[PDB]
Structure formats: C-alpha cells, structure tokens
C-alpha cells in the first residue's frame, strides 16, 4: 500500500483506495469507547510485559490531535497548556499575506506584511495547513537577555537598523463603502 | 512568538548600540529571561536551538510534537560541530563600552509574529469634544472622538482617597455642567 | 468554481488556495458555525438532585 | 427569540484565521454560566476537538 | 523529490546503526 500510494499524483492513487482496500476505518466518538486503540504500530506491539496484546486499531500519528492554530506551534508538549492556548488564540491575529489576490479584494481592515518569511523549523502538520506558502511572521535573531531594562516586564527591544531595512514592516488598508 | 510570549516593543536602538557576537551578528529581539521559568516554555528554547542548527546546516528542521527522535542532546551535539556552544550560548559584547558580558547570552534564530494591535489605532485623547443628544455627556469610542468612562470603581477609589474635590470636579465640572 | 483548474481561478481574480465553503451575502463572507446539541432518538437517564425526582429518563 | 451568532463574518486577517473560523464550533449553552462542567475539556475529545485551541475570555 | 530520497536514506541509515541507544533526555510509558 505504501509503494502504491507513494506513486500517487502521477497515476491516480488516492485515499479512497485505502478505504476500499480495508486498511483504514472511520470510528466515531461513540464507537471509540469499545476499541483498543494503539498509539504507534511498532513500539506498542513487539513483545514485552503482557499489557493487553489485543489491539484492534492504531492511530496514524499522535500529533494529529492538534487543530489548526495549535499545529503550527513547534514542540507544543514542551510548554504548559495555557501558553499553548494563548498562542493558538493569538495566531489568528498574526498579520501577513492573508490571500494572494489581496489587491483585488476590497475588504475592511486588511493587513499585509512586506516580507513574510517561512519558519526555519516547520512541523510535519503545517505542510498541509498551507502555512509555508502563506506564513505570518519573520525569523529574527532573538537573544534572550536583559540588555538595558526596557524589556524586563514582558517587553522586547528591537533593532532600529533592522526596522530601517524592512524588519516586520507591514501595511494597513481601510476600505470604504458609499452610494 | 509561537509559544505565547507576547509583548510590546519598549525601545528601539540602532545597530551600533545593540550587542554583538564574536562576529557582526546583532540580536533583533531581546525578550526577558524571567518570562521563561514562570511560564515554563522550554519549547521556545528548543525552537531557538533547532533554528540555529538549521541555519548553520542550511535546511529546514522538524518540530513534530511527538517524534521519539528529537531530544536536546542530539541537537546540541549537532550544533557543537559548527564552532558554536552545544547549548547555544554565545559571548556577546556591551554595545556601548565594548566590554564582554560576564554571563554568556543565549542568542539564536527564532520565528516571531506581529499582531494588528498597533498603538496608532489605540491612542486617543479628548478636550471638550462632541456631546451626545439625550444626556449631555461626551461620546464613546475612539472613532467618534469620545471620552473615557469614569467607572464606579474609580469613584470608590477616589472616595477612599478622600479627594472629594477631585471627585466633584470629575463628575460635574468635566462631565456635564448645567444650571 | 466546481473542479476548476487554477488557471481560470487566477484569471477570475481568485486563488486556488482559498478553502471556500462560505456564503456571500451583500458582499460579506458569511460562515455557518457548526452547532452541537444532544443526540436525538437516544435514551438518557440523568439523576437531577435539585428536584423531586431521583432519576429522569429524557429522550 | 432565536439564536444569535450562528452566522459570523469570516475573519480574513490571515490564512490560519480563515482556516480556524471555517472549522469552528459553538455550544448553545448560555453565555457566562455559573456551572463549570461543560467548559472543562472532556476525555472523549481525543482526536475530534483540539485540546489547546479555545478562547480565554468569558466563552 | 530530493527531500523524499533524503528521508528514505535517513530512515535506512537509522535502521542500520542499531548498535546502542543510551540517551538521557527520552523516556516512554510502560504500564503493567
């Protein structure tokens, strides 16, 4: 199945083929309570202390539990949950190229960033969220320190020369309607 | 950032004033070190480290939440193979005097965002602006050029202050004089 | 724009990256939030204590 | 007498925001309820609802 | 395509070098 799927796009092979072959299966929230789900195929089945040895299914990848805004978070488990939630709710407020045909739209309160670079570290999940094609930030050389004191209680110190060179320099639109 | 480390730019210094590494690399953003332990955001440090190793190598790294092959020790070993400290710390110089900093600062690439909450869209003031029609009091809202509300809690706090004259002025003289 | 190539989308002042699935009313993108409720045709036996009944068989 | 907020203006500020809004849910329970059982992340929301993405205000 | 073949050769190399894995910053649950 993996070999036949890796040569997709070129011929015609898709997810419907996997579903029809009898390899994957849709289990809803109500039926998930009566199945022995497994996290990884290799680690949880080799041969060890007899836990259940009666696994019926197996998850694709554990990280798939994350949603849209949470997936773009790198290393979410290395951080406390409230901060992951704050980032996820705050990701929707990050500016940048919100749509390619922005010059044709006449929406109200549209923000666009000049140089929206791509994260130097990208999760395997954002490959499909389309984040890399339309990112919402710039990779900056961040040095965690207390240089002067203007960055002590949740504040930062930016480089004037960098801003002069176009560091996070964006634009602000404001459309109007009148007839 | 992508971890919940919000903040507002305090001051902007030129390149000559920013610190610098053994070569001409001045930090672009400088966050408070104190924000890490209370918020418990080691993922931000891991992202910075992996961004540094990715920049040195020259290809985007992986930040999948659950990978079983991405720890700190292996990344540190990879980073040590480019003339940089395995933990990412580097020796800076005081941008003003040019003396080395005793503590080895932790500098490295990191992906940062920008929110739409500009100061120009929030700054507001008033000096006897337009007045409503039903109750002759100032308007509400920055767009309509209105005044701030002197809530009941502010009244209670002023009364605790015992500043009855200021309270009288605030509720009558600069709110709605009438005979 | 049902199964239309990216060429026409670009020529029609649109992008292939737009997820779609949103109505356009008076030139405003309207989206329907998926509301959740209690599943129908299923028997529920609660134990409301702030009442005169020990158990209640809602359906 | 009917519900409110069923149809919202789609926030076109960034592609991530558009993605989140188009796949967003909303419970019909009254706003700012004294109870705390429905707001808590339940164990059954494994792989179905993001355990991290949620507002931080009254809702 | 090059990233794909890079991933495959990385995986086969990781499968090859199975001499020893003694690392401090890693763990996994083991019930019963």
């Amino acid at each position: 199945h993996i070999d036949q799927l890796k040569e997709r796009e070129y011929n015609n092979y898709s997810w419907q083929d996997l579903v029809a072959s009898g390899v994957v299966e849709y289990i809803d929230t109500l039926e998930e309570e009566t199945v022995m789900l497994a996290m990884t195929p290799d680690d949880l089945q080799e041969k060890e202390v007899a836990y259940c040895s009666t696994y019926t299914h197996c998850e694709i990848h554990p990280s798939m539990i994350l949603g849209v805004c949470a997936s773009i978070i790198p290393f979410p488990d290395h951080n406390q949950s409230p901060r992951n939630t704050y980032q996820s709710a705050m990701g929707k407020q990050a500016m940048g190229v919100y749509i390619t045909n922005f010059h044709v739209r006449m929406d109200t309160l549209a923000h666009v960033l000049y140089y929206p670079q791509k994260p130097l570290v990208t999760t395997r999940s954002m490959e499909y969220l389309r984040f890399r094609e339309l990112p919402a930030g710039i990779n900056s050389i961040v040095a965690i320190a207390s240089y002067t004191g203007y960055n002590q209680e949740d504040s930062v110190i930016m480089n004037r020369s960098a801003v002069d060179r176009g560091f996070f320099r964006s634009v602000f639109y404001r459309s109007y309607k009148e007839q | 950032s992508r971890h919940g480390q919000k903040g507002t730019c305090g001051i902007q210094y030129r390149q000559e004033d920013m610190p610098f590494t053994c070569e001409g690399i001045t930090p672009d953003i400088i966050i408070n070190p104190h924000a890490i332990p209370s918020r418990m955001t080691i993922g931000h440090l891991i992202e910075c480290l992996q961004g540094k190793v990715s920049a040195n190598k020259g290809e985007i790294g992986d930040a999948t939440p659950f990978n079983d092959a991405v720890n700190v020790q292996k990344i540190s070993n990879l980073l040590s193979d480019y003339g940089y400290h395995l933990r990412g710390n580097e020796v800076l110089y005081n941008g003003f005097t040019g003396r080395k900093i005793t503590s080895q600062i932790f500098i490295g690439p990191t992906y940062y965002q920008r929110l739409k909450h500009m100061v120009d869209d929030k700054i507001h003031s008033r000096a006897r602006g337009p007045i409503q029609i039903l109750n002759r009091q100032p308007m509400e809202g920055r767009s309509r050029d209105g005044g701030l509300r002197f809530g009941e809690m502010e009244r209670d706090c002023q009364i605790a202050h015992g500043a009855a004259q200021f309270l009288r002025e605030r509720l009558f003289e600069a709110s709605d004089p009438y005979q | 724009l049902n199964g239309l190539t990216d060429r026409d989308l670009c020529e029609l002042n649109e992008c292939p990256l737009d997820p779609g699935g949103y109505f356009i009313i008076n030139g405003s993108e309207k989206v329907l939030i998926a509301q959740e409720k209690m599943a129908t045709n299923t028997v529920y036996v609660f134990a409301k204590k702030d009442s005169k009944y020990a158990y209640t068989g809602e359906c | 007498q009917a519900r409110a907020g069923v149809s919202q203006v789609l926030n076109r500020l960034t592609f991530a925001s558009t993605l989140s809004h188009l796949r967003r849910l909303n419970s019909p329970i009254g706003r700012d309820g004294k109870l705390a059982k429905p707001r808590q992340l339940h164990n059954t929301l494994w792989g179905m609802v993001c355990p991290a993405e949620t507002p931080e205000g009254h809702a | 395509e090059w990233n794909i073949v890079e991933s495959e050769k990385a995986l086969v190399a990781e499968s090859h070098n199975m001499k020893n894995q003694q690392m401090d910053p890693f763990t996994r649950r083991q019930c019963k």
């Binding site: 993996i2 898709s14 694709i60 499909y128 | - | - | 188009l22 796949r23 | 499968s15």
Partner: peptide, 28 residues
C-alpha cells in the same frame, strides 16, 4: 510485508493522501 522501524516516513504519506483527496473544509 510489514513495515518495521521504517514507519515515520510512511506515517505521513497516508496523511498526504487524505489531505489531497479531502480538503480541510470538506465537511462544510
């Protein structure tokens, strides 16, 4: 044949197929 060990790369090919066949807003 089963895929021991070499599964991290094959874990995401099925994901790519799923997201290619069905869009993110496919439910609506």
């Amino acid at each position: 044949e089963i895929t021991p060990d070499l599964w991290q790369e094959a874990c995401w090919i099925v994901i790519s197929s799923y997201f290619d066949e069905k869009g993110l807003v496919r439910q609506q």
